[PDB]
Amino acid sequence: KAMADIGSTAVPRDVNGGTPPKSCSSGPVYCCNKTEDSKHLDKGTTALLGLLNIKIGDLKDLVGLNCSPLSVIGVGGNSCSAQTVCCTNTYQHGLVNVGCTPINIGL
């Protein structure tokens, strides 16, 4: 039972030291003014993506325009007053963002 084995237990969501504000271990969370459907971006957003050579058809969930990277939790990271999502990568300091999923920080 999780002392000489990892088969009897199955709690991947339970973490040792679960800090109140949930975040992604895949990287910092992002606070985007609006996450845009990467399936069908606006031509204006598609434009930026084209500038950066991003593949729209390769895109997954959402993108994020003018997004703020939340890497330092607390002052700054937990100071997101906009929409908070979990993105896989970031471009243009936040002007365009990729692989964004709506994260429930819990607070």
Swiss-Prot record:
Q: Where in the cell is it found?
A: Secreted; Secreted, Cell wall
Q: What is its main location?
A: secreted
Disulfide bond annotation, renumbered to this chain: 24-86, 31-80, 32-67, 87-100
In terms of SMART domains, this protein maps to: HYDRO
Which terms in the GO cellular component ontology are assigned?
extracellular region; fungal-type cell wall
Q: Which InterPro entries match?
A: Hydrophobin, Hydrophobin_CS
Listed A to Z, the keywords are:
Cell wall, Disulfide bond, Glycoprotein, Secreted, Signal
List GO molecular-function terms, semicolon-separated. Answer: structural constituent of cell wall
The reply to whether Disulfide bond figures as a keyword in the UniProt entry is: yes
Q: Which residues are glycosylated?
A: 33
Q: Which Pfam families match?
A: Hydrophobin (PF01185)
- CDD domains linked: hydrophobin_I (cd23507)
| Free-text function comment from the UniProt entry | Aerial growth, conidiation, and dispersal of filamentous fungi in the environment rely upon a capability of their secreting small amphipathic proteins called hydrophobins (HPBs) with low sequence identity. Class I can self-assemble into an outermost layer of rodlet bundles on aerial cell surfaces, conferring cellular hydrophobicity that supports fungal growth, development and dispersal; whereas Class II form highly ordered films at water-air interfaces through intermolecular interactions but contribute nothing to the rodlet structure.
Share what the entry says about its subunit structure, partners included: Self-assembles to form functional amyloid fibrils called rodlets. Self-assembly into fibrillar rodlets occurs spontaneously at hydrophobic:hydrophilic interfaces and the rodlets further associate laterally to form amphipathic monolayers.
Note on domains (UniProt): The N-terminal tail up to Lys-22 is not required for self-assembly into rodlets and is amenable to modification so that functionalized hydrophobin assemblies can be created.
Q: Which family does it belong to?
A: Belongs to the fungal hydrophobin family.
Q: What is this protein called?
A: Class I hydrophobin SC16
